[PDB]
Amino acid sequence: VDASRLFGESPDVVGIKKMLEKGKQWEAIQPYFDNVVREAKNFLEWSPNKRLANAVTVAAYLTSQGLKTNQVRKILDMARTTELKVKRGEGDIKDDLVKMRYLLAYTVGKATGQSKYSLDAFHRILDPMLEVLMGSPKKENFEKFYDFLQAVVAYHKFFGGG
């Protein structure tokens, strides 16, 4: 089951839900994607379903950990208000992306205790993509993260989180 049923695109999206609800099998199989996503520093380097396939592996890498929702929401309810200003409102959201990276730095500095490797799983994968929005437009090269924004949120409920 360890790196055998789980494959690239859509092999074990339905069978890995019972294994995550295990300890040593997911500690080494899901560690390769969390490093390849770190090596995926270019966000829009995947026009196919590679993001949605990697979204299952990252949410499985967030399944055994905590991932409290009250720290999740404010980072992502700010990501909508950037999008709500895309709709003929603004064209430069440069002043808010500094505050967007500050809320994730404030999040990993507040959750102390048994939630270290949880929020550092959160701190690992997104910072290759959270540098990309500064020197890039919004009509491309942000929206593709806005799909992968909720892609990891949803399967994390499906493997038994919340």
Partner: protein, 267 residues
């Protein structure tokens, strides 16, 4: 039989959410505009709570008004939860799925009901159309600017669960239009309308409310009459009864027919 038209008394003004304001939908979000992402009071939700409070007011007074408004000889104060009849001598005579409501069954019974002539009736065969229309009330202009500049318009309130609420102090624009269809009884229908608004300033609006999510408070800007002559000619020749620093508990108070002397001047 005999629907006429004489004008449209237009009540504008601004709703003040004194406490936080929660009108939900389906982590428990208040309804927002899908376009601008901003909350609003629906006119469906405001016309109901203006009718919820006024029917209960009429529910306690069915004896002493059947000489002023006839066809209240049909009703005795009660409901029809005790026995499944759509129409018996009880005031709440509409099945309306599992919860009863007062709806007169006909045009000419509802022509003399003080409730169903104002908020509108429904019936098999003949039915009676509403006379007030209540637009959906959005945020004002100056609270757009607070949303443009990062001031909070919403907040999550952990109750272990979160009831989101429109943050207190926020203001909405509400427009109420009354259709003058008969000159003999317009005074009552403007008095019975503001009676229903005085009850809303003591009750609440939307959400839990018994935990303090209400305290809605009206701030009037303009009454306008708009006679039939205004529609034929575009000139702004309509009556403007300003009550800009008045309260709903002062307009309907003695101070009413001093404000409404110029609606007489057109009849």
């Amino acid at each position: 039989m005999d629907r006429r038209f004489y004008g449209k008394i237009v009540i504008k003004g601004k709703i003040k959410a004194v406490t936080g304001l929660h009108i939900g939908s389906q982590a428990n979000p208040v309804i927002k505009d899908p376009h601008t992402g901003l909350p609003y009071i629906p006119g469906s939700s405001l016309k109901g709570r203006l009718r919820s409070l006024f029917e209960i007011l009429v529910n306690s007074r069915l004896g002493e008004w059947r000489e002023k408004y006839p066809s209240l000889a049909n009703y005795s104060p009660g409901s029809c939860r005790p026995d499944n009849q759509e129409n018996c001598g009880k005031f709440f005579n509409r099945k309306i799925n599992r919860g009863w409501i007062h709806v007169c069954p006909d045009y000419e019974t509802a022509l003399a009901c003080p409730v169903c002539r104002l908020f509108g009736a429904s019936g098999k065969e003949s039915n009676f159309p509403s006379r007030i229309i209540v637009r959906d009330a959005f945020l004002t202009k100056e609270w757009e600017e607070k949303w443009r500049a990062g001031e909070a318009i919403t907040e999550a309130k952990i109750e272990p669960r979160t009831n989101e609420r429109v943050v207190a102090g926020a203001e909405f624009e509400f427009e109420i239009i009354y259709n003058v269809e008969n000159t003999t009884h317009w005074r009552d229908d403007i008095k019975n309308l503001l009676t229903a608004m005085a009850l809303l300033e003591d009750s609440y609006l939307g959400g839990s409310g018994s935990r303090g999510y209400g305290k809605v408070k009206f701030i009037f800007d303009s009454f306008e009459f708009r006679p039939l002559d205004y529609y034929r000619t575009g000139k702004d020749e309509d009556i403007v009864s300003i009550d800009a620093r008045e309260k709903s508990v002062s307009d309907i108070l003695s101070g009413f027919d001093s404000l409404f002397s110029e609606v007489e001047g057109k009849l």
